[PDB]
CSV table of C-alpha atoms and ligand atoms in Angstrom, one decimal:
chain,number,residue,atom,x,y,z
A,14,UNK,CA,108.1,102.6,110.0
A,15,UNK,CA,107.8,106.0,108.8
A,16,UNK,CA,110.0,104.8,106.1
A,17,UNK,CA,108.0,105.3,103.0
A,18,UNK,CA,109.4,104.1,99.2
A,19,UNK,CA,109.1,107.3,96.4
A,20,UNK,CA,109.7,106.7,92.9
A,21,UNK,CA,110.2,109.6,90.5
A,22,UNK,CA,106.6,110.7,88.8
A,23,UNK,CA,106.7,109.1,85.6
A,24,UNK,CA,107.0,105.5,87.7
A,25,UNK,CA,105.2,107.1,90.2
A,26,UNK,CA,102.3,106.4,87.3
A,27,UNK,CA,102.5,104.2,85.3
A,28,UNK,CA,104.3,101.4,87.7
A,29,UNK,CA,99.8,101.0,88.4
A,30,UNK,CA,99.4,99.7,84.9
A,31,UNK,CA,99.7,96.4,83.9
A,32,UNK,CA,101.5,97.2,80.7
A,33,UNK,CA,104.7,99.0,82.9
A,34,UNK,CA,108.0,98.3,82.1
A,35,UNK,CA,111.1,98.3,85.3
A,36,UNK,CA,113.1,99.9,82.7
A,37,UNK,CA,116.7,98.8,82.3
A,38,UNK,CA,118.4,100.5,85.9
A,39,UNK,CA,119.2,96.9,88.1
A,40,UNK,CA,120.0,99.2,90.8
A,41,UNK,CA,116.4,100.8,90.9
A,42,UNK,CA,114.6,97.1,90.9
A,43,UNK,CA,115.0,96.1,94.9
A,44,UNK,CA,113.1,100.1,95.7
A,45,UNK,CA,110.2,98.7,93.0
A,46,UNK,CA,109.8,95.8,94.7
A,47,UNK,CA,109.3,97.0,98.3
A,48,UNK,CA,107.3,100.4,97.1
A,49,UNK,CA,104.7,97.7,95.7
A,50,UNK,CA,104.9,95.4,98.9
A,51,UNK,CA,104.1,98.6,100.9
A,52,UNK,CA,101.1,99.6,98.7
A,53,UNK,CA,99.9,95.9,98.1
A,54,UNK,CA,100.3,95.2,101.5
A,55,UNK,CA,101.3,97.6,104.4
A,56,UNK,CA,104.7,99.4,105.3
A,57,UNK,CA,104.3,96.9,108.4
A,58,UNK,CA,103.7,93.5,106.6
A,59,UNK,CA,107.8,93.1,106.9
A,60,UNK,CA,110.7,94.5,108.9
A,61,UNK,CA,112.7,96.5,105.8
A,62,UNK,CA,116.0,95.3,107.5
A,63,UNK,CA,114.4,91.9,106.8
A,64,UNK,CA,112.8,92.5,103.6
A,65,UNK,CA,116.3,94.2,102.2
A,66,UNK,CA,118.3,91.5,103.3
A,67,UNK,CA,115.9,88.5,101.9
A,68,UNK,CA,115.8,90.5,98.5
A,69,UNK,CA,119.6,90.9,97.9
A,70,UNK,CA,119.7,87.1,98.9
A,71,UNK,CA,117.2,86.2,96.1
A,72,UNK,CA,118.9,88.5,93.9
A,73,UNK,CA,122.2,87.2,94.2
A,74,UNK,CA,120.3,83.2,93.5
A,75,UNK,CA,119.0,84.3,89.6
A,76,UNK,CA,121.8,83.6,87.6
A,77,UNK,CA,123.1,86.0,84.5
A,78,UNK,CA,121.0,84.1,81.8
A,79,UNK,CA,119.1,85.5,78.7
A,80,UNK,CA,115.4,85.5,80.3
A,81,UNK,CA,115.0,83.5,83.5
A,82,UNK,CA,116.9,86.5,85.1
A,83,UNK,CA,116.1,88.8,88.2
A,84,UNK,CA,114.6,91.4,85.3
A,85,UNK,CA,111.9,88.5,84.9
A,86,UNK,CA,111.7,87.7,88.7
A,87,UNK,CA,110.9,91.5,89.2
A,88,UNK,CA,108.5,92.2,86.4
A,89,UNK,CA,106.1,88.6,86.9
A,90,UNK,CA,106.1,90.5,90.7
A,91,UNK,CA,104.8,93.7,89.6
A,92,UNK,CA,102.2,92.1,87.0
A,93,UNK,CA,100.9,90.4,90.0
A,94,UNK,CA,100.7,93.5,92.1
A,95,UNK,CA,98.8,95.1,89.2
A,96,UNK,CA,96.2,92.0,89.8
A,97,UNK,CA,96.3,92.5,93.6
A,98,UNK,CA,95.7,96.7,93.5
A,99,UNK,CA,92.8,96.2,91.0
A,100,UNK,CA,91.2,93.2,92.8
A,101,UNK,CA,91.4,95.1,96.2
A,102,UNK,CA,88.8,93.1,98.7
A,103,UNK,CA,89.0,89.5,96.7
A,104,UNK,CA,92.6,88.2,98.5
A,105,UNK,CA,93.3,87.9,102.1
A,106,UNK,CA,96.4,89.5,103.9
A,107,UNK,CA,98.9,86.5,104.0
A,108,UNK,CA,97.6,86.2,100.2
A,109,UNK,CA,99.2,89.2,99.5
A,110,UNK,CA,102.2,89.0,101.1
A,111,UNK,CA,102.7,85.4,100.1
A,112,UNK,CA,102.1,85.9,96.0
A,113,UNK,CA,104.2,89.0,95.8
A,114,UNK,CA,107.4,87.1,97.4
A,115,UNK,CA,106.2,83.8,95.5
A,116,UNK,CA,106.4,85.7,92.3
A,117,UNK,CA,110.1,87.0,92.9
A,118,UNK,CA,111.4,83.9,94.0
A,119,UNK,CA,109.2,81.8,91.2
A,120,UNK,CA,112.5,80.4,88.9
A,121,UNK,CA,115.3,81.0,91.8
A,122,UNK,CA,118.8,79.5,90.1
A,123,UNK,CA,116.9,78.7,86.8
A,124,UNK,CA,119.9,77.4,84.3
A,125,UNK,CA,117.5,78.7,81.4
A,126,UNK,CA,116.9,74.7,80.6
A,127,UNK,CA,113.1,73.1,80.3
A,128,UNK,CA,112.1,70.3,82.5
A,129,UNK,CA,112.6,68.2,79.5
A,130,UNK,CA,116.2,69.2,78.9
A,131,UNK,CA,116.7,68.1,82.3
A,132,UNK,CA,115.3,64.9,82.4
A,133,UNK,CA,116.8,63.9,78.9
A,134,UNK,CA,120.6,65.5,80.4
A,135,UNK,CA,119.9,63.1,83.2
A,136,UNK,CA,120.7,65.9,85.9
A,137,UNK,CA,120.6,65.3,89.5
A,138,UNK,CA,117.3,67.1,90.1
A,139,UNK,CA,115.6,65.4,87.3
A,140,UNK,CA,116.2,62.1,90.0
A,141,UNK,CA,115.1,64.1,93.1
A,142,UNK,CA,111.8,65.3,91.5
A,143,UNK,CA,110.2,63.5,88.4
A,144,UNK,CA,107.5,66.4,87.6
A,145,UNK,CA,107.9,70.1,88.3
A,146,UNK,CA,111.4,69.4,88.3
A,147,UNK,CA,112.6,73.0,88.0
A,148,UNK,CA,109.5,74.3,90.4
A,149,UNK,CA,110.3,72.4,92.7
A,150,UNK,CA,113.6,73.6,92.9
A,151,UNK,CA,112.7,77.1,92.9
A,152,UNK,CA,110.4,76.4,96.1
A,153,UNK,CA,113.6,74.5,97.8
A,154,UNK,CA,115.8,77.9,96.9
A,155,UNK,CA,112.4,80.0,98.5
A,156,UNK,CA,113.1,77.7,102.0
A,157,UNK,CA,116.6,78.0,102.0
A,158,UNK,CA,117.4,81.6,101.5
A,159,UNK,CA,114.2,82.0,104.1
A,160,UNK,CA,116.3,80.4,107.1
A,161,UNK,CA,119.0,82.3,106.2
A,162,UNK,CA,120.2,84.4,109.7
A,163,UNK,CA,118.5,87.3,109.5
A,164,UNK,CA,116.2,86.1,106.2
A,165,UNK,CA,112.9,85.3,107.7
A,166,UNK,CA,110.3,87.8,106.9
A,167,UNK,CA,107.7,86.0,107.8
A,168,UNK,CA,109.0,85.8,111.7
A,169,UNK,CA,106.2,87.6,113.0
A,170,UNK,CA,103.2,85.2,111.7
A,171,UNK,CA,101.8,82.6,114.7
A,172,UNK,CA,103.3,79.0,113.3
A,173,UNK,CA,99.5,78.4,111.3
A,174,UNK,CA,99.8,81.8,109.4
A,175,UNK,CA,103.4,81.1,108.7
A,176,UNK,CA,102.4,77.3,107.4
A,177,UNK,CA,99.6,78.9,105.8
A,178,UNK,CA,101.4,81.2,104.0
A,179,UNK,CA,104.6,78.4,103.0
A,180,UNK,CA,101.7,77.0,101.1
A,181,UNK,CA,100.5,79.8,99.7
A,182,UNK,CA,104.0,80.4,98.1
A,183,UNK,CA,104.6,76.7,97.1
A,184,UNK,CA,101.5,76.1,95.3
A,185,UNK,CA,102.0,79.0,93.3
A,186,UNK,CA,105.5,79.1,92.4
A,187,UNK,CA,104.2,74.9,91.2
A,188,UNK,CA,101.4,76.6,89.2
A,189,UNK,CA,103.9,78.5,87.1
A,190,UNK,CA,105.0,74.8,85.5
A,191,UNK,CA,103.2,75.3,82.3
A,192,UNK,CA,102.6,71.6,81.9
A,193,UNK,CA,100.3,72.4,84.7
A,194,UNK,CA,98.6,75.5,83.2
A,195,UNK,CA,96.5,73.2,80.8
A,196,UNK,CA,94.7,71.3,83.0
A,197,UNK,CA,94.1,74.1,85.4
A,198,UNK,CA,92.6,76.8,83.1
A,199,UNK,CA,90.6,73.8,81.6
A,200,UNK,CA,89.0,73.1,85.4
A,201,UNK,CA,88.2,76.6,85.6
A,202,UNK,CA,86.7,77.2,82.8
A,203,UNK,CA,84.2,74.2,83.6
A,204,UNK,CA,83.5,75.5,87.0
A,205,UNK,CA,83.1,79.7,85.3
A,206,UNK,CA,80.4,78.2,83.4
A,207,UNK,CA,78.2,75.8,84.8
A,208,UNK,CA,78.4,78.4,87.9
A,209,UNK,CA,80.5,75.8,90.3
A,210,UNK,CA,83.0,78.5,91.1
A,211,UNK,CA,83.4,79.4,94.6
A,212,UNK,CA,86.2,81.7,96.4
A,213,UNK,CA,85.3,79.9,99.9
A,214,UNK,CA,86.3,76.9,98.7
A,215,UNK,CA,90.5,76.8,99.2
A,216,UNK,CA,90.6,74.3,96.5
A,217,UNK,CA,89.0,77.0,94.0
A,218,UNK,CA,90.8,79.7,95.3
A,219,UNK,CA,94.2,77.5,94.7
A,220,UNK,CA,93.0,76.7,90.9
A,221,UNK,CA,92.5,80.8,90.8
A,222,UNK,CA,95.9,81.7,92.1
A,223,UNK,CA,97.5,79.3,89.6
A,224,UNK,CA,96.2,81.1,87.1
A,225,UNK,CA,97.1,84.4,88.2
A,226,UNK,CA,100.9,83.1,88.6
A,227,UNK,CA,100.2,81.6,84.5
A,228,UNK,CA,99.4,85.2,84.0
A,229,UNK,CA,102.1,87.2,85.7
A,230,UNK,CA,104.8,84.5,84.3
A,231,UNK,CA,103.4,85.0,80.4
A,232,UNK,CA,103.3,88.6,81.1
A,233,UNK,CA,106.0,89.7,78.4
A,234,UNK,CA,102.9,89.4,75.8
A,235,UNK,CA,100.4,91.6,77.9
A,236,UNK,CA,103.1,94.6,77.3
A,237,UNK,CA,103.7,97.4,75.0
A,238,UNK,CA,104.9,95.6,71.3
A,239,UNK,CA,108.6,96.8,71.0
A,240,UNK,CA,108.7,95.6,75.3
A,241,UNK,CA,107.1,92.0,73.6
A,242,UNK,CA,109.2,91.9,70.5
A,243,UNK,CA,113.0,92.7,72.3
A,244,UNK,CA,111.9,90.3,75.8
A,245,UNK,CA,110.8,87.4,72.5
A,246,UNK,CA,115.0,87.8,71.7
A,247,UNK,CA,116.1,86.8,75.1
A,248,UNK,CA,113.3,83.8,75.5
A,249,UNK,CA,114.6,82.3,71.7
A,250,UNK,CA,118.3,83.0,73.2
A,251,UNK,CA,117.4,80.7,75.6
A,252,UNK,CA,115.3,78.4,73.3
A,253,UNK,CA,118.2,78.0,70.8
A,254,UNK,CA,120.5,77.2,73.5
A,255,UNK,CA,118.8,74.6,74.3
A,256,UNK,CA,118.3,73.4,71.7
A,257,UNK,CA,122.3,73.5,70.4
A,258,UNK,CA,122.3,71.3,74.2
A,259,UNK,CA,119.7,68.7,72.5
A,260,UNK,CA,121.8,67.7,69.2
A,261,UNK,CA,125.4,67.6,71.4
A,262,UNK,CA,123.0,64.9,73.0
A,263,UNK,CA,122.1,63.8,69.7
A,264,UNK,CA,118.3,64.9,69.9
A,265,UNK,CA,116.8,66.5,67.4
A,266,UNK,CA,115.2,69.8,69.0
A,267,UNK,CA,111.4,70.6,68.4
A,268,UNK,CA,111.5,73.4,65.9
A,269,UNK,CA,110.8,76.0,68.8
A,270,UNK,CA,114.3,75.3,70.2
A,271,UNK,CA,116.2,75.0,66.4
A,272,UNK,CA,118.1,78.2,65.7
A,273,UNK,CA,118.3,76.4,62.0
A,274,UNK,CA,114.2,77.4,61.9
A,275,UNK,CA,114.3,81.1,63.2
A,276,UNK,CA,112.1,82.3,60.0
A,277,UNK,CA,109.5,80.1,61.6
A,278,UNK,CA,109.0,82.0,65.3
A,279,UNK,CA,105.9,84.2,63.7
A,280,UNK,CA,104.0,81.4,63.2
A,281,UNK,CA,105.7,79.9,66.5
A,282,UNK,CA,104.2,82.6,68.2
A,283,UNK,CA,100.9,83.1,67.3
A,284,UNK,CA,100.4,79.1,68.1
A,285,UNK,CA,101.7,80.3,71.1
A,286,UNK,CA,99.2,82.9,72.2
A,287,UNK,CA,96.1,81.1,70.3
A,288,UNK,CA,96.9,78.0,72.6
A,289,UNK,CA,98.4,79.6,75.8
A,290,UNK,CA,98.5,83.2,76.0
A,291,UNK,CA,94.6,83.9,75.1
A,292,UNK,CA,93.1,81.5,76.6
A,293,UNK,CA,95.3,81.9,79.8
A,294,UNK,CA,94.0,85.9,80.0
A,295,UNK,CA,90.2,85.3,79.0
A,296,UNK,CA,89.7,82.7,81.6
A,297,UNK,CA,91.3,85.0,84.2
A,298,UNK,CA,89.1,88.2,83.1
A,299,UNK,CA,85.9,85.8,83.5
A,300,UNK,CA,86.9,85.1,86.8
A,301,UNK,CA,88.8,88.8,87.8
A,302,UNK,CA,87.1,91.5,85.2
A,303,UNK,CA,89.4,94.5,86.5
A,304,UNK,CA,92.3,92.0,84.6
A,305,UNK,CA,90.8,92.9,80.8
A,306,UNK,CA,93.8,95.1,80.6
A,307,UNK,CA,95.9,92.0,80.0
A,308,UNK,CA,93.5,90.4,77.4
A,309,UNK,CA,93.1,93.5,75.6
A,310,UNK,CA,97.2,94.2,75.2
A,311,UNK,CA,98.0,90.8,74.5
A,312,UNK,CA,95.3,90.3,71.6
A,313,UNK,CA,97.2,93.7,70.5
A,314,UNK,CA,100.3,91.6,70.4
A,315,UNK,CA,99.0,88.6,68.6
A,316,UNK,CA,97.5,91.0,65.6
A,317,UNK,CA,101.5,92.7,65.9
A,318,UNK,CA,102.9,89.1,65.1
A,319,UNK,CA,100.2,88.7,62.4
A,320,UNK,CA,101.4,91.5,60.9
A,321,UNK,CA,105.3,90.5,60.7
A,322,UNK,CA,104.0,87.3,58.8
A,323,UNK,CA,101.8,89.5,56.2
A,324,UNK,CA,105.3,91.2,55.7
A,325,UNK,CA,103.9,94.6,57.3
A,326,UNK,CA,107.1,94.5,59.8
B,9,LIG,C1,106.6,84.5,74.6
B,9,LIG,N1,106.6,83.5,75.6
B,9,LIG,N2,106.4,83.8,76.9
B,9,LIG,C2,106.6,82.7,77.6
B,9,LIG,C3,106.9,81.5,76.8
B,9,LIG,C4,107.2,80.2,77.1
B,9,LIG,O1,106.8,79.2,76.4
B,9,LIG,N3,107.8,79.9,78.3
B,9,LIG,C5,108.9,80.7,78.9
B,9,LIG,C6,109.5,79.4,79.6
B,9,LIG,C7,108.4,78.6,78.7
B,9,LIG,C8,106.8,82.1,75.5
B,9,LIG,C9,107.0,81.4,74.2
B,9,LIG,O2,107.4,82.1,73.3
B,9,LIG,N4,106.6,80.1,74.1
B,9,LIG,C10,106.5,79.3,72.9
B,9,LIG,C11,105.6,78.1,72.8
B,9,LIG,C12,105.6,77.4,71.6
B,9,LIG,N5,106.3,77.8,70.5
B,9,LIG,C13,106.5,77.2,69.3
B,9,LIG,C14,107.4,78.1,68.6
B,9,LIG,C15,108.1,77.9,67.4
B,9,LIG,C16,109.1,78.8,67.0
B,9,LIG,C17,109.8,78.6,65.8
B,9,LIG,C18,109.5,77.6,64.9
B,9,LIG,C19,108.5,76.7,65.3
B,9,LIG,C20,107.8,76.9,66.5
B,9,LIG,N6,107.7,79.2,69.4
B,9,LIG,C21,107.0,79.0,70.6
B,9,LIG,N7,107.1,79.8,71.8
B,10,LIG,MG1,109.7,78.9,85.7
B,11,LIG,ZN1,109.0,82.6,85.1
C-alpha cells in the first residue's frame, strides 16, 4: 500500500508529456506502467502482486516482431495516460483503470500480419472472426491471461463493475481496427458540429473512447521526429514482410507493403497523416482541447516528411 513507484528525475518529467519516449531499457517498462496506473488511478485500484503477475503474463503474449511488440503495447499505454492526466474530471474510475490495461493488451500475440493478410492466407482466425479479425483476438488473449490463477486484477469490482469494465476494454481494444477509425471519427465529427455530442450518452462516450484508442495506437507521429522517423523503420519492416508473404501467395502487394517501392514511403506517408493521422488528432482536440499537444507534434511531423521529399533530408 505504502508501496509507491519512483522513476529517476528526467522520467520523473517528462514521462507527463505526450511526446515521451520509454527509452530503450525492457527491464524499466513493467515500473512505467504501474507508476502511471498509480497516478492515473490510485495505488489501490489493483493488488501489485496481481498487477505484476498480469503484466509479466501480457508481456511474455507480444511476440519479438519489428513493431507490434511490448515497446508498442507500453508506449500506446502511456499516450493514453497523458489523455487521462490532462482530461482529469471527464472519465469515470473503471474508465481509467479499464483503458490503461486495454491499451497494453490492445495487439496481444500480433504476428505483425493485417487483417487482410489473414483472410487472403486463409488462417484459422480469419474463419473464427470475419471483421476485426486480429482485434478480436487480442480481446480473447485480454480474457485468457485474466483467468489465469492469480491474474485477475479486477477481483475486487461487484460482478456489474467487473462486466462494466470487460466492456470497457473490448470496445476499445475493437476501436483500434483502423477500418473502424473511418467511420467513427466521421460520426463524431457530425455530432462536434451540429452540437449533438453528449458525454451522458454511453453510445457517445463509446464513439469518444474509440477515438482516443485511434490516438494512442497512431501515436509514433505525435513524437519527437528522429522518435517518428526510426519507429517508421520497424512499421515498413513489418509492411515489406508482408508484403514478401503476398507474392509467395502470388498477390501483388499494394505499394505500401512492396519493399521494390521504398523511394515511395514519403509520399506514403504524408497520404497517411493528411487522411488518418490529422484528421484523427483534430477531431479529438475538438472534443478533448487539453489533447492539442498531439495535433501540434504531429503537423510538426507531416512538414518533417515534406521536407525529405523537397530533398532537405
Ligand atoms: C506511421 N504509421 N503509424 C501507424 C500506421 C499504420 O498504418 N498502422 C500500423 C498498423 C497499421 C502507420 C503508417 O505508416 N500507415 C500507412 C498508411 C498508408 N500508407 C501508404 C504508404 C505507401 C508507402 C510507400 C509507397 C506507397 C504508399 N505508406 C503508408 N503507411
Ligand atoms: Mg492492432
Ligand atoms: Zn497497436
Amino acid at each position: 500500500g505504502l508501496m509507491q513507484f519512483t522513476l529517476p528525475v528526467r522520467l520523473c518529467k517528462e514521462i507527463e508529456l505526450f511526446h515521451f519516449d520509454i527509452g530503450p531499457f525492457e527491464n524499466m517498462w513493467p515500473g512505467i506502467f504501474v507508476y502511471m496506473v498509480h497516478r492515473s488511478c490510485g495505488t489501490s485500484c489493483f493488488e501489485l502482486e496481481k498487477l505484476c503477475r498480469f503484466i509479466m503474463s501480457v508481456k511474455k503474449n507480444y511476440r519479438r516482431v519489428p513493431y507490434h511488440n511490448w515497446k508498442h503495447a507500453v508506449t500506446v499505454a502511456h499516450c493514453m495516460y497523458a489523455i487521462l492526466q490532462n482530461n482529469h474530471t471527464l472519465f469515470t474510475d473503471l474508465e481509467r483503470k479499464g483503458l490503461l490495461i486495454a491499451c497494453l493488451c490492445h495487439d496481444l500475440d500480433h504476428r505483425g500480419f493485417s487483417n487482410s493478410y489473414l483472410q487472403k492466407f486463409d488462417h484459422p482466425l480469419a474463419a473464427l472472426y470475419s471483421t476485426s479479425t486480429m482485434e478480436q483476438h487480442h480481446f480473447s488473449q485480454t480474457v485468457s491471461i485474466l483467468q489465469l490463477e492469480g491474474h485477475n486484477i479486477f477481483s475486487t469490482l461487484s460482478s456489474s463493475e467487473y462486466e462494466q469494465v470487460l466492456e470497457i476494454i473490448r470496445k476499445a481494444i475493437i476501436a483500434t481496427d483502423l477500418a473502424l477509425y473511418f467511420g467513427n471519427r466521421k460520426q463524431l465529427e457530425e455530432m462536434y458540429q451540429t452540437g449533438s455530442l453528449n458525454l451522458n450518452n454511453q453510445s457517445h462516450r463509446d464513439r469518444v473512447i474509440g477515438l482516443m484508442m485511434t490516438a494512442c495506437d497512431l501515436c509514433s507521429v505525435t513524437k519527437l521526429w528522429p522518435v517518428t522517423k526510426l519507429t517508421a523503420n520497424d512499421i515498413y519492416a513489418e509492411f515489406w514482410a508482408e508484403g514478401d508473404e503476398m507474392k509467395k501467395l502470388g498477390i501483388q502487394p499494394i505499394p505500401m507493403m512492396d519493399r521494390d517501392k521504398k523511394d515511395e514511403v514519403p509520399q506514403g506517408q504524408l497520404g497517411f497523416y493528411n487522411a488518418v493521422a490529422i484528421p484523427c488528432y483534430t477531431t479529438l482536440t475538438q472534443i478533448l482541447p487539453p489533447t492539442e499537444p498531439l495535433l501540434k507534434a504531429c503537423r510538426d511531423n507531416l512538414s518533417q516528411w515534406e521536407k525529405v521529399i523537397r530533398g532537405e533530408e
